[PDB]
């Protein structure tokens, strides 16, 4: 029952990373009028959009907040993987820590853009161990 729930904007960086992973994935819709219901355990994979302002506001995409706001969706989160770009410095991938704090779940990994070979191999291994232990 290995499952990913992920968000990706129109740039589809997080989408492309997630499609390189072994586990089945479900996409949180971009459209703010649309919502999804998930009733299985999942690892959450989301990008950061605070924009390096000095400030965790907008760090978690609004669509991800809307998804987690539903307690039926919220309760199934085993852990969060966040992405972004180290050039945002103190704001790098901070969507993960924010979600980790809000849900009281582990921050499992942080990566950049569409991810490397190493990121794919590591996240596959981490998702496996997360659903076992």
């Amino acid at each position: 029952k290995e499952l990913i729930v992920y968000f990706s904007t129109q740039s589809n960086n997080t989408h492309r990373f997630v499609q390189k992973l072994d586990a089945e994935s479900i996409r949180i819709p971009i459209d703010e009028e649309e919502r999804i219901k998930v009733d299985e355990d999942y690892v959450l994979i989301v990008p950061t959009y605070s924009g390096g302002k000095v400030d965790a506001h907008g760090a978690v995409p609004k669509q991800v907040i809307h998804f987690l706001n539903d307690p039926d969706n919220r309760k199934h989160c085993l852990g969060v993987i966040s992405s972004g770009n180290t050039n945002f410095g103190d704001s790098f991938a901070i969507a993960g820590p924010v979600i980790s704090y809000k849900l009281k779940v582990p921050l499992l990994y942080q990566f950049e853009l569409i991810g490397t070979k190493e990121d794919v191999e590591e996240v596959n291994r981490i998702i496996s161990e997360t659903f076992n232990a």
């Binding site: 129109q10 390096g52 965790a56 706001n69 770009n85 050039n87 410095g89 790098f92 490397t116 190493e118």
Partner: protein, 313 residues
């Protein structure tokens, strides 16, 4: 629909005088990603006067004439690349825009890269002598290895292939300055010029979005081309990046000669070369080993490397 039977002024000016012009429509937006980027870069507006660089004087005065010269030369070199991108590169992108908002975003990019170039002037005004400033300018003009890099990109901006122009516009903020940006982070890892490093971090907060946006617009255009032409463009990107990596390595070995920073500076460069490729939708072929820099220096870039009322709980 008025939009489908009219052109933007810049389309009219350079490409098609056969149709009447439409005003920009910020109320009906083709691509929400444009509004995303516009809001962030305008909200992130800054000027180098905002940073008290005078507080770097103590750590600056502890550096010998060789290290002070290295910094002035490095930053004058980066000033040149920002002057290229502000005066040619970003403004050249406006007429090749997919959307109306993209035209205005590239005008913001050209202005803010102008602010980047100006910020080095602010540092020099505080720390450097007139002799150090003049010497650095002479050195930049006469350094053929330095000059080779912008000389390789400018032709793509002035030529009539918009995709090659776009790749060049992405490569500048995505790669070409990071060999130089290594130096301030190396120094601030040793508690030297900490306020200068704050200016560099504000510059990177802009350049990361510039590289992303150019790479995003590149991908939207190439996606419409035939599989053959997509393979052709991918070939061109790797061929150009190979050339630019070669020119950058040659320059950095001359810049950092006798300081022993060339090797780490080149690894930081290749790390960013990897991110440039990813921002164009291509896999990075670089090994985590090829791109590794010292943790204490990387920590100066990001310490994380190691709220809205819509929250219902």
């Amino acid at each position: 629909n008025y939009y489908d039977r009219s052109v933007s002024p810049v389309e009219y000016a350079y490409f098609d005088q056969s149709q009447n012009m439409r005003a920009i429509n910020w109320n009906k937006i083709v691509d929400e990603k444009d509004l995303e980027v516009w809001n962030r870069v305008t909200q992130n507006f800054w000027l180098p006067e905002n940073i008290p660089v005078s507080n770097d004087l103590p750590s600056w005065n502890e550096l010998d004439d060789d290290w002070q010269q290295l910094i002035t030369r490095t930053f004058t070199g980066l000033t040149l690349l920002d002057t290229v991108q502000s005066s040619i590169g970003d403004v050249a992108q406006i007429k090749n825009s997919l959307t109306e908002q993209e035209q205005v975003i590239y005008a913001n990019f050209a202005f803010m890269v102008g602010v980047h170039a100006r910020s080095y002037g602010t540092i020099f005004s505080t720390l450097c002598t007139s002799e150090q400033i003049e010497e650095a300018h002479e050195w930049v003009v006469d350094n053929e290895a330095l000059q080779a890099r912008p000389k390789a990109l400018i032709p793509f901006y002035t030529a009539d292939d918009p995709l090659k122009s776009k790749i060049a516009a992405a490569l500048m903020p995505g790669f070409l300055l990071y060999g130089g940006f290594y130096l301030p982070f190396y120094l601030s890892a040793r508690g030297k010029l900490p306020n200068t490093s704050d200016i560099i971090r504000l510059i990177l907060r802009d350049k990361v979005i510039h590289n992303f946006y150019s790479g995003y617009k590149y991908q939207l255009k190439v996606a419409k081309l035939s599989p053959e032409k997509q393979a052709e463009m991918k070939q061109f990107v790797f061929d150009l990046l190979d050339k630019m990596i070669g020119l950058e390595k040659t320059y950095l070995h001359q810049l950092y000669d006798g300081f022993g920073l060339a090797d780490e500076a080149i690894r930081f460069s290749l790390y960013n070369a990897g991110k440039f490729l990813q921002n164009l939708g291509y896999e990075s072929p670089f090994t985590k080993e090829e791109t590794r820099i010292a943790p204490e220096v990387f920590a100066q870039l990001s310490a994380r490397a190691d709220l809205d009322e819509d929250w219902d709980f």
